[PDB]
Design a protein around this nucleic acid. Structure first.
Ligand SMILES: [Mg+2]
Ligand SMILES: [Mg+2]
Ligand SMILES: [Mg+2]
Ligand SMILES: [Mg+2]
Ligand SMILES: [Mg+2]
Ligand SMILES: [Mg+2]
Ligand SMILES: [Mg+2]
Ligand SMILES: [Mg+2]
Ligand SMILES: [Mg+2]
Ligand SMILES: [Mg+2]
Ligand SMILES: [Mg+2]
Ligand SMILES: [Mg+2]
Ligand SMILES: [Mg+2]
Ligand SMILES: [Mg+2]
Ligand SMILES: [Mg+2]
Ligand SMILES: [Mg+2]
Ligand SMILES: [Mg+2]
Ligand SMILES: [Mg+2]
Ligand SMILES: [Mg+2]
Ligand SMILES: [Mg+2]
Ligand SMILES: [Mg+2]
Ligand SMILES: [Mg+2]
Ligand SMILES: [Mg+2]
Ligand SMILES: [Mg+2]
Ligand SMILES: [Mg+2]
Ligand SMILES: [Mg+2]
Ligand SMILES: [Mg+2]
Ligand SMILES: [Mg+2]
Ligand SMILES: [Mg+2]
Ligand SMILES: [Mg+2]
Ligand SMILES: [Mg+2]
Ligand SMILES: [Mg+2]
Ligand SMILES: [Mg+2]
Ligand SMILES: [Mg+2]
Ligand SMILES: [Mg+2]
Ligand SMILES: [Mg+2]
Ligand SMILES: [Mg+2]
Ligand SMILES: [Mg+2]
Ligand SMILES: [Mg+2]
Ligand SMILES: [Mg+2]
Ligand SMILES: [Mg+2]
Ligand SMILES: [Mg+2]
Ligand SMILES: [Mg+2]
Ligand SMILES: [Mg+2]
Ligand SMILES: [Mg+2]
Ligand SMILES: [Zn+2]
Lengths: 59, 220, 95, 74
RNA sequence: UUCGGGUCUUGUAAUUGGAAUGAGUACAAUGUAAAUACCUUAACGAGGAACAACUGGAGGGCAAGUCUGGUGCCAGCAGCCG
RNA sequence: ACCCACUCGGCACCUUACGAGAAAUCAAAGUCUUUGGGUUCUGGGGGGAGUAUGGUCGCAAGGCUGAAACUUAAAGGAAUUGACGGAAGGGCACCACCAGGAGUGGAGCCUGCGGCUUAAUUUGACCAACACGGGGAAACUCACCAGGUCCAGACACAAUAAGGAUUGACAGAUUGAGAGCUCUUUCUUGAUUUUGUGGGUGGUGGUGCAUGGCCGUUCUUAGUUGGUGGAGUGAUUUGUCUGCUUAAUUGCGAUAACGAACGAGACCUUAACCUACUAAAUAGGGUUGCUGGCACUUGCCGGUUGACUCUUCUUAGAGGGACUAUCGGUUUCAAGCCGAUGGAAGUUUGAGGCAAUAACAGGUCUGUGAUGCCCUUAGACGUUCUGGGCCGCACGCGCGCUACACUGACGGAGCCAGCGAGUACAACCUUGGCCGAGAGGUCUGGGUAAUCUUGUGAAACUCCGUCGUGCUGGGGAUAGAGCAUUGUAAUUAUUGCUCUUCAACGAGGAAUUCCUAGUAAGCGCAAGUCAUCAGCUUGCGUUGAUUACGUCCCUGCCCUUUGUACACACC
RNA sequence: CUCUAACUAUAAAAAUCUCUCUUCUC
């Protein structure tokens, strides 16, 4: 939520974060945080919205 | 923090201009409150307590879509209570909207005396009761310093009210916290709904604050 | 292909004579023991068995009437038992 | 899934070839000629230069430094 | 000016000191029909003050652990849900 | 007999909550925590059980009265959201059908599974597994098997130890080895090492039911979502709908809903059309040269990197173009549908690319130096070398290929494309000239590419002949022999070529697959696999149709209504 | 501000299903 708040503070017209994995439980689950609006179809998906994927190692 | 609060309601405009000084003016003329910032302005010290968080599920074709119901009680322990009940996706948002509703639904209560009057009122004025669902709550005046003889949720509601001594009796499925708290809220707000001999003489019907100060509303 | 497990310090083999209901079986243990066999853990609804199936079963030293069936052999490890011959060979169980 | 068993070997063992250490090895290579001149019991290798001693095993002499290219019958 | 004196206090450390005291023993005397015992009191009687506080529980109801090792729907736990 | 008004009594009814209820609902089920008009009967969780017993009534059937022992954590009521219905309404889909076409299933073979077999025949998938893991593996690949090597065990400490911690080896035994792997002997080497402890690495080892990422599927359908506001005590609901329209939650609208967000659409790529612009020896054309031939009239078909000129085609940039444009019907006359005309184009213009919320215990640890945990970590599940296997074969199944011939096979002759690709620190695409009958060989020359292969002179196809209904000149499987190519290596035939034997096969049961226009189908070519190998896939083009232009009958999908004792949801 | 008219007409068969349920706190 801090990341989303900072991003929307930067002037972005919408931010979204997916955190998938073992969030404090053995069974896997994905949490979705969003604000604003994110398009999904047509090169507007390439022209405006930029994405990033990362892996984080925990214990 | 950051708060501008452009007022969208005439009541909100009057409050922001500083023309309504006490919440008693709001309660007296039965004014409709739709901006929580009015209640924040009038009662700076409204404490809260999240009574319960309850997961409620809806069965759709794919999995079970789960939200959370927050039961928030707001008040100042000086004769003002509100009971917000909200449902939302994220628990924090649920609690925020629940306190928000609770502030919107503030209500005054009529604390009285069990026997002779010596100091400030310590208990309710008369016996009162409310009923939500199948839960019926009966509040009965108690002698001074008898504590709040009530279940923990109702006890916390009375503590937020400012009622220091009161007896209670609940009938039904008082298990469900929302029903019990709503019934107790109905009773404690009904305390100002009982005509009493000391409340018989008629008054002069002082003009409404938005009639005398209509000019300061209507943003031009 | 899995390794076949032999008996040890109390467990013994047997053959199902007739399978009862409610997870119960009649099993002839090869000591002349027409014992009652209880379907047990890891064996409830994960592996299925039937009439005339080679079986391995653990005894209960505090009650010899009933005994708890543990592992079932798939009619080929049964053949291996049959050649190594730890069980009596006076019985024919074929297909 | 994989079902692996403990490996069984039809070979007793192959043991690490331990180097044959020799105490006082160097002096056996030489011979003191009575407080003065000294000689060498082993033969010198021509390809490497002075000092390196030939290896005599049986009806030939063998080198150590250029070992591979020198094995000359006695 | 980073500090920082700790300027003012409150805990944690097998460091470290001096006190006080019984629970026990016991001259007596009181007590009692006679004795115990209690009240009083000589003389002893605390350093790990070994003069050593247990009984249940730590998912919820219900205060308190999603620490470590063991067993892996066994052994067992569980008033109920588990 | 009606009509109007009123009243008493009765079966009833509509609206509403301002009252009551857990609600469905009730004008009584109201006047009940602000609890008392009179009065009778009945119930105290479910089951056992309205059972036994004892009475009593009855001809009998059976009625009335009527427990316990024991067992159980629930049984049950109303309603909400889903799912389901051999329930209803309205719409859709050649992964549905109708009308059809081509088929598969019958035969050979090729490949992939299962089973069997084996030392191993390594393994993961069982609509959404099965020509799938780019899985066309002779070595490698590799993961399996019989064996043989090595540490590529950092680092810290201890320990030996510089009068040797150690390393390596000629030659022989040993080995498959020209392996100092192990031994015989001896020689070489210098603090890197060696043997113990901790620890660390490596692992196509296990767990996709611990995970990420990605992809597939639910679902190619049109469906989702929250903010104020309304209704509910509430789970939830309205907004998201009575209609009509659309491919569409697409719009016209009506409205306790108002404004919005994602999806759809829009958007990009591609395919058209551009005698309008910019231009071009890496594309074409004209005129004229310099020539060749034939005609003889000045003309025809050619060659030339000689000159001048142009951009119609070929290119690729900026742009234009279609927005259902005009007109006629039909439509609460609105959204829109149908037809004709003009057009290049009137199915969203065709074809695609991205493609929402929620989810699957769908697949992948075997793509990853992505990875938690567990296992192993020295004769190793690490790594490498040799050889074998992944291809075996009493048997079933799934993609396909070649065929059963006359609309044909075989000879000649005609001669037509579009996607590609192509060599450097390596050796690619190959023209052309000589050889060979062919595969192929050799000598040269282009091309790091609109330049050269290349106009890829491809097959089907076309013309003229041979064959003549004969399992035949169809079919080309199975074999024998030989010649070559790639390869360290070709046997268990890599592949190509030459001669011969020429098998099953007579249009294929039940059943089942794909598809509505340059589509299906026939035909091949290029690219990815590639040192050599496709019967595979991804693309491209040639010839090019029959039959629809509809429906909910089978299989499903979307919305609404209804019922449910279902929610691990009709498996 | 005056008004009661049009219509039909489908019932063949279809039984059963072994797991396993997992925390919401700013
Ligand atoms: Mg959009
Ligand atoms: Mg789109
Ligand atoms: Mg049982
Ligand atoms: Mg204890
Ligand atoms: Mg315990
Ligand atoms: Mg414990
Ligand atoms: Mg607690
Ligand atoms: Mg009962
Ligand atoms: Mg009953
Ligand atoms: Mg009787
Ligand atoms: Mg019900
Ligand atoms: Mg089908
Ligand atoms: Mg058909
Ligand atoms: Mg065919
Ligand atoms: Mg076939
Ligand atoms: Mg077949
Ligand atoms: Mg196999
Ligand atoms: Mg599908
Ligand atoms: Mg091959
Ligand atoms: Mg190998
Ligand atoms: Mg191999
Ligand atoms: Mg080996
Ligand atoms: Mg690996
Ligand atoms: Mg390996
Ligand atoms: Mg999975
Ligand atoms: Mg989707
Ligand atoms: Mg709302
Ligand atoms: Mg809705
Ligand atoms: Mg042009
Ligand atoms: Mg018109
Ligand atoms: Mg399209
Ligand atoms: Mg799975
Ligand atoms: Mg691994
Ligand atoms: Mg294979
Ligand atoms: Mg396939
Ligand atoms: Mg021909
Ligand atoms: Mg071409
Ligand atoms: Mg040709
Ligand atoms: Mg023939
Ligand atoms: Mg032929
Ligand atoms: Mg053909
Ligand atoms: Mg392939
Ligand atoms: Mg159609
Ligand atoms: Mg249920
Ligand atoms: Mg059924
Ligand atoms: Zn030498």
């Amino acid at each position: 939520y801090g990341v989303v708040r900072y991003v929307m503070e930067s002037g972005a017209k919408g931010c979204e974060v997916v955190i998938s994995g073992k969030l404090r439980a053995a069974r896997a689950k994905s949490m979705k945080f969003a604000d604003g609006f994110l398009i999904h179809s047509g090169q507007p998906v390439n022209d405006f919205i930029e994405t990033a994927t990362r892996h984080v190692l925990l214990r | 923090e950051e708060k501008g609060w452009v007022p969208v309601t005439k009541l909100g405009r009057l409050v922001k201009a500083g023309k309504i000084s006490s919440i008693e003016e709001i309660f007296l003329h039965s004014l409709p409150v739709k901006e929580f910032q009015i209640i924040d302005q009038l009662l700076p010290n409204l404490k809260d307590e999240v009574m319960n968080i309850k997961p409620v599920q809806k069965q759709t074709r794919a999995g079970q879509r789960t939200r959370f119901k927050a039961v928030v009680v707001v008040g100042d322990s000086n004769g003002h209570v509100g009971l917000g009940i909200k449902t939302a996706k994220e628990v924090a948002g649920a609690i925020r909207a629940g306190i928000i509703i609770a502030k919107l639904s503030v209500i005054p209560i009529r604390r009285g005396y069990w026997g002779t009057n010596l100091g400030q009122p310590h208990s309710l004025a008369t016996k009162t009761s409310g009923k939500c669902g199948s839960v019926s709550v009966r509040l009965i005046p108690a002698p001074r310093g008898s504590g709040i003889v009530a279940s923990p949720a109702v006890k916390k509601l009375m503590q937020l009210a400012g009622v220091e001594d009161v007896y209670t009796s609940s009938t039904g499925s008082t298990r469900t916290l929302e029903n019990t708290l709503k019934a107790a809220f109905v009773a404690i707000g009904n305390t100002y709904g009982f005509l009493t001999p000391n409340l018989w003489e008629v008054q002069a019907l002082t003009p409404s604050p938005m009639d005398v100060y209509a000019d300061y509303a209507t943003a031009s | 292909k899995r390794e076949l497990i032999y008996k040890e310090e109390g467990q013994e083999y047997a053959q199902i004579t007739k399978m009862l209901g409610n997870g119960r079986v009649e099993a002839s243990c090869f000591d002349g023991n027409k014992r009652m066999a209880h379907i047990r853990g890891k064996l409830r609804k994960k592996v299925w068995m039937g009439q005339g199936d080679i079986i391995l079963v653990s005894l209960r030293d505090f009650q010899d009437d009933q005994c708890d069936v543990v592992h079932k052999y798939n009619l080929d490890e049964a053949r291996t038992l049959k050649n190594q011959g730890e069980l009596p060979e006076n019985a024919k169980i074929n297909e | 899934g994989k079902k692996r068993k403990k490996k069984v070997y039809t070979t007793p063992k192959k043991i690490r070839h331990k180097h044959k250490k020799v105490k006082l090895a160097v002096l056996n290579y030489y011979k003191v000629d009575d407080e003065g001149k000294v000689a060498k019991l082993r033969k010198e290798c021509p390809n490497c230069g002075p000092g390196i001693f030939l290896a005599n095993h049986g009806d030939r002499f063998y080198c150590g430094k250029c070992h591979s290219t020198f094995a000359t019958q006695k």
